[PDB]
């Protein structure tokens, strides 16, 4: 089921230098909560400044949903350390409040008023918030409080040399392989096998607290439960075809969306009634990206310069790390992305891509189940999970040797050894571990307990890269960037919307 | 997709006498049922004697589950006639009971009520029954009532010869492992043609099933649900990581499985309130418990295990277990089928088979699954292992049959006549018209009268045939003698035991 | 044979402050006996209250098997005093019952029906008792009545700091460091039973060796029979493929073992006529059934197992479990032992320790075995792993002690005083003269009066000492408060049980 | 437990050609028996000629105990085929008789009258026979009918040359003595894998013996009872450190009295019983699991030959008869020994005393009586049992496999590596071993039953098979030549046996 990559691997083993210069970036989300596990209703904390302009710290869908962001980085440890500074600072400057360590919220009722992300009075800020309002009215607020971790990754220019359009075509290859084989991610690092009742077909088992869980599950975050664009026939074979599918989607009405309406008593309800308001409304486990310019849309930018990097978006929050992501995970994704770039990927239609989901779903709902088998696309399940994983890891291990040879030491290889172990025993995986803790204490209990311990820890730890003064400065500067946008003579919102993306 | 077998074929055409003396054998399973289609709850018919020792007629899982076995035989007609005599005698000696003519039984409400095969109070008889008790407890009784046909096959020595010392047993072995590998690759042609289980009763339960008010589930283009995951409870040899490249490897993998404890079956416990529930708590209680569509074999010497015997003498012959019951024959198997299998097996021995890893083998299965579930689907395409599907089924079968026809020409020239050739012409037509296959035929019947109605009717018709037909090879007096003799042997084993079953058991589990 | 640890000692002597703030803990076990040495068959003393939940006093495998436990502590005298209090208080609240002075029981028969530790009706409490049921059925009750002392030990943050350990790094460098410690404990930790081993002899009712008879079995030159194959029944971690090179490997190996079905234990069956016999039939029922003379630890959150905790947070502290009961102290452990252990652990952290395969670990045991059965033997030599024995034991200990002395100079300079150094001078003498060790001493006594006789005598003397002594840290009221807090924490859990035992048992076994 | 041989192995991989030209030989014993299994009482078959002087076919203790011998050989396949031609020819020329396929006899009665091997009127021949008479009277006849396989092994010169005239000649004896010390330590691995006598007929009988209804004794987890106290002196003090010490200890053994053997007498009723009353009648009465050797001339004792030329080759004698081969041995075995013997020559072995040697036996006994027993542990010498058997085996096979890589690189192909993969699997699973396999068959149909059946199939197999290397002509030629040699020796014989014996006893 794993394809034959023997040829491309040998090539790589003979061009090791061609991997030197990997660029990475992390994004990690977390809910601000009270000590009692309730959703914080205070505003974005003072010391962090302007969520709308800050370079490193901002908000996602909700006002209480922190989003931490690292600068693009060449060094793993540096980047994780940077990310940890952000957390250190924030944990110290947010009152008696703390950071929720899990993907899944707990203490949140059904229909609970969730303050949307607040970006001020500028056009840009209003738009951002409106997009959110939009999302609230189409999909519900609740599911939007589910947090995750995003990983940015680019291969060095050297890699494509050794072997623009060649580049974009290469990243499309990567994405296609991610669709076929990336269920490996929730298997290993998936960390949401349970969900609060408040949050609701499946064989769910219920506890006395009213915790719902699937015995063998991995990542309910990624399930239909946690996350409608199936009539879009978006494809990943080719730059122009992808973009074209993306654009036509922007211009694709919706019956469901025309209903909500744009307005009611003057309140704008959404940006538009199109299936996609903006392009990023598009569901994407993995996403082709190019840094955009000003007034330039993601598709414009892609079209212009081709694919620059990719964004992996399938990771749940790592509960066992205070920054919600660790070295082991980062290193695994390096290995995996590279492999995805080496492996041979036939072109896939729309419906063929949708078919690659069946394996994802199986892994998501029951990945840790003994005897579990996977299948090729929609076809009958045939292949035992553990053997597939071992096959995959034989290859990754080879990638790892190469990578360890250029970087020096054996860090990647050790990581392969460590995770391969998880195929012979699923009880080693994140989901099994966190599930054991959740059955005894519940989601809430586990959440508060971790959140508290992490709070103490992070609070008492020194700043390493970002000093206190760097934060104070960026606060001040971000507040000011926002005020400058606010005070500017911007255009009428209407025609403005009209001239966007 | 069919490989190139030109030389092996030209080689064969020049060495025709290399195929002379093919040895074959048949086994056929069937449920003893009442007129209403339900399992007979009576004991093994007394006229059939001891199921434990009987030469031709025994039982499988269930007490009601008959197993017919023919002696190894070089003549096809004689073998089929022999099998039929077994059915004829049985048919007239089971009171008002009859035989279920389908692989898939009719609605069963209470699986756990199904009387296990009974073998008396001898230690060996009790071991055999306990083995089944274990199967019941591990996998459920219900699915063990699903039935099929087994075809045993050996090439003549002259075949190997035309193709020294300690190397002979080894070369023969490697030849048979090649056959097996090829079966895994191309063997799906078997359920395509002769598959006869497109439907299943809901009592026996993700898939696009059509449903009926009575609870008959089916798939429109399916061939053999019996071979699907829904049709067997066991662990496929292919899934356990057992491979077919090398004799020693294969044997080791198998014995490893006999020896490996199971968390799952330990949880059942080896006991519960003085009732022994299993033989042991290992993956495989014994070697037979392994699910094998195709199995290497060598006749055992007393006390020796099947894998022991393989290791000792290498591979002697092959057992093809993948045939559904043929509903269009009273004996559940026909001449056209046996002849096809002769052709295909021979071809599997000529065709070149690269060695395969666990996961490579698993890939050969992708095509099997397609054929099993939607084999009759217009426009169906097959692939090379896991690789993208691109080869239209009808063309692939025509290509295989051009080779099979050459094999047929050769066998036809040594036996005299045109029988094998005719068979190729009859069967190849099924690739252009899939409504000619067994599965399409039986599905039509089933949609009209159900599994139950279709089965009750054929069972009745076949009972009436088999009740009236005179015995051809065996005569009444032979069944009577074998009754006496078989009872006698069971009696002797019972008396000859010197130890408590618990003591004897500790020593053989 | 002792490594060159120069560089690291030098370093240490320059960073004395780095050793400040060592945390410790003790656990001691003792059988409640009657005056006549027989096993007390009453129940956990009222005054002590709830064994299941009590913060300081509890039970081990038997209802009569007392287990005393001190809070984590940075101060040696305080910790020991605390433990002494528990004993004092207990020894006056248990009738004419007294505490067995030794590791090795006596007056306990091979078939004796020993009452299992009783922890109530709650689910948690019931599981606890069943764990024990299973221990009995698998290994035998008697063996589990052997008693010992556990020493917990963590280095201060300052130590690691002084020795880049920030953010995430810390957790790993500390873990690594403690694995270095364990490895070195396997190589060099035989020094412990040499010095402190106190079971030269064993009762008839318990038992290959050159044993000598009296009804008492003894070895002339033996140290700790309790650490021998005749002393613990379990499966040594060293034996199960478990290694100490790396946090993840270690945990993986441990987790593998609790998931490993055992043929042997499956036969015990898991239910024996309504009576549940074990939690399950796996090699290890729960992770703590693993035989571990030195054990890596992290404080467990509810819902999490020892391995989960380790995986999450890394190694926090070490548990040393190979100490026999010190006969010469009424609390079974003394200040000289505790101080030696600090010294030895510290040195174990400094000394370089190559990584070790599980077969190289097995090799380290050769020396242990020699010491355990003949450590006090004149002319006894030790080897580098499995390699030829060539290093006289006394010289090896002297060499080790020249290092431990330097380490003591350092701890003494920080605490103020000479206590550690004194301990080194006293103990090193045991290498020139083995008759100074605990084993020689207690052996002389056991030969004269027997195990039985020796035990009774010391038990009655110590009982009298402790029944007379004032409490010092704990007031009679602190104890009385805990019967309550304890006896109620238990009820609370007994009302919280929604789900029955079988349904809950099944999320956990 | 398994030493560190990393450096020697690394050395080996750098110098692959050091193993090119390994030399070997096989010997194989088997009883002539009827279809009912009873002992054949006819004489040494006629197409085979003179047992006394034949080059390839001969007799051991009993006249019915055949002994097959191959010429020294460099090619594995060729040597096996050769041994096989011998069996084929014989199988067709022994009438209705056939060859007992196991080490352990069954149809032989306790205190039975077995015809001693007969070698004719010659001084020499009468001596050979008298020796056996001696063994009969000393140890009992029955035990001498237990059969086995011997393997000869020598390293090529190129091996020694690359490890380093006559400065070389002492370097070799030391190398083989090392091989032998290591064999004593780790060689129990042989009966573990290939031992095939877990059972013994009651005729041959304080052990935990289990017993069937046929009257067949067995141990559950046993491997090779032939090697045990029941299947075949420890005061001799023979060591393997040095060539002189060894030869001295051995000559001293022959000059050494035995009050047990003095009681037998040297003669009763004109009937000579032994050669003498000494602890060993001759040097080769010495019990030896493994034996250092040099090709003896004529008039040379084995000790003399050694003393003179040094150790030329090694003789491995602990092999049970392989029941699953018509010739009682197979390629897989032969290859394993190549590996092991080579490994034995690479691994450091300290010098050993008598009592240290005796201690190596503790493990041997464990493996022999219960080597298939789960959780079985082994120890260094007499020391505490500590090391799980499976893992010891695997450690060993880790090294054997590196050796195998090397040998496969020069011979071409992957045959040696494959053998490693197969045999190591016997460590995870004893039920793959010979003894486990044979035991299942024996429990069901007895030693007797299993034997007769295997013999019968092998007879038929072999009778039908064509000669491949030897031709009949060759066998008929060797028959004549072997006949003259006996005649020429019976002719040119000076004095009456009564006095020739006067210098050789």
Task: Write up what this structure looks like.
- 4 copies of one chain form a homotetramer.
- With 501 residues, chain A is α+β, with helices and mostly antiparallel strands.
- Chain A has 2 domains: 2-16 and 371-424, Helix Hairpins (Helix non-globular), CATH 6.10.140.800; 18-370 and 425-501, Creatine Kinase, Chain A, domain 2 (2-Layer Sandwich).
- In chain A, 45% of the residues lie in helices and 11% in strands.
- The first copy, chain A, contains 17 helices and 14 strands.
- The first copy, chain A, has helices at residues 6-13, 76-92, 123-139, 157-162, 165-181, 184-189, 239-250, 255-260, 298-305, 327-342, 350-355, 357-366, 385-407, 411-424, 430-460, 468-487, 493-498, and strands at 23-33, 57-59, 65-69, 98-99, 149-154, 194-196, 205-206, 211-213, 263-264, 267-268, 286-289, 309-315, 373-374, 383-384.
- In chain A, the strands form 4 sheets. In chain A, strands 1, 2, 3, 4, 5, 11 and 12 form a 7-stranded antiparallel sheet that branches. Chain A has a 3-stranded antiparallel sheet with strand order 6-8-7, with helices on one face.
- In chain A, β2 and β3 (65-69) form a beta hairpin.
- The longest helix of chain A is centred in the C-terminal third of the chain and has 31 residues, at 430-460.
- The radius of gyration of chain A is 22 Å and the shape is globular.
- Chain A starts with 5 loop residues before the first helix and ends with a helix.
- The A-C interface holds A 80-81, 84, 208, 320-321, 326-327, 414, 417-418, 421, 424-425, 427-428, 433, 436-441, 446, 449, 461-462, 464 and C 166-168, 246, 248-249, 251-252, 255-256, 259, 301-305, 308, 311-312, 498-499, 507.
- Chain A: Its EC number is 6.3.2.2.
């Amino acid at each position: 089921m794993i394809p034959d990559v023997s040829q491309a691997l040998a090539w790589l083993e003979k061009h090791p230098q061609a991997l030197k210069g990997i660029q990475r970036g992390l994004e990690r989300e977390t809910l601000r909560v009270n000590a009692d596990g309730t959703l914080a209703t205070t505003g974005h904390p003072e010391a962090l400044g302007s969520a709308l302009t800050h370079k490193w710290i901002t908000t996602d869908f909700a006002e209480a949903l922190l989003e931490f962001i690292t600068p693009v980085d060449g060094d793993i440890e540096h980047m994780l350390t940077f990310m940890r500074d952000l957390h250190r600072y924030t944990a110290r400057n947010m009152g008696d409040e703390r950071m929720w360590p899990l993907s899944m919220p707990s203490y949140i009722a059904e229909g609970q008023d969730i303050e949307l992300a607040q970006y001020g009075t500028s056009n840009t800020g209003r738009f951002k918030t409106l997009y959110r309002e939009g999302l609230k009215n189409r999909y519900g607020a609740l599911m939007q409080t589910i947090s995750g971790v995003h990983y940015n990754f680019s291969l060095p220019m050297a890699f494509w040399q050794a072997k623009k359009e060649k580049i974009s075509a290469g990243y499309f290859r990567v994405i296609r392989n991610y669709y076929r084989f990336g269920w490996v991610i929730p298997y290993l690092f998936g960390a949401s096998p349970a969900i609060s009742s408040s949050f609701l077909s499946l064989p769910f088992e219920k506890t006395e607290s009213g915790m719902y869980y699937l015995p063998y599950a991995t990542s309910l975050r990624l399930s239909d439960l946690g996350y409608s664009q199936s009539n879009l026939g978006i494809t990943f074979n080719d730059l122009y075809e992808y973009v074209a599918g993306l654009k036509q989607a922007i211009k694709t009405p919706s019956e469901e969306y025309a209903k909500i309406g744009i307005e009611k008593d003057g309140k704008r309800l959404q940006i538009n009634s199109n299936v996609l308001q903006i392009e990023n409304e598009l569901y994407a486990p993995i996403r082709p990206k190019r840094v955009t310019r000003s007034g330039e849309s993601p598709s414009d930018a892609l079209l212009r310069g081709g694919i620059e990097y990719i964004e992996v978006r399938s990771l749940d929050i790592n509960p066992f790390s205070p920054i919600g992501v660790d070295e082991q995970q980062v290193r695994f994704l390096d290995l995996f992305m590279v492999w995805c770039a080496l492996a041979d990927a036939p072109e896939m239609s729309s419906s063929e891509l949708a078919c690659t989901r069946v394996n994802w779903n199986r892994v998501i709902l029951e990945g840790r189940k003994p005897g579990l088998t996977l299948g090729i696309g929609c076809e009958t399940a045939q292949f035992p999970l553990p053997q597939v994983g071992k096959d995959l890891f034989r290859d990754l291990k080879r990638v790892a040797q190469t990578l360890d040879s250029i970087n020096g030491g054996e860090a990647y290889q050790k990581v392969c050894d460590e995770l391969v172990a998880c195929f012979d025993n699923p009880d080693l995986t994140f989901s099994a571990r966190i599930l054991r803790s959740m059955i005894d204490t519940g989601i809430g209990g586990t959440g508060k307990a971790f959140a508290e311990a992490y709070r103490n820890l992070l609070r008492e730890e020194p700043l390493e890269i970002l000093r206190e003064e760097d934060f104070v400065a960026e606060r001040e500067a971000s507040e000011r960037r926002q005020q400058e946008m606010e005070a500017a003579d911007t255009e009428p919102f209407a025609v403005w919307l009209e001239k966007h993306a």
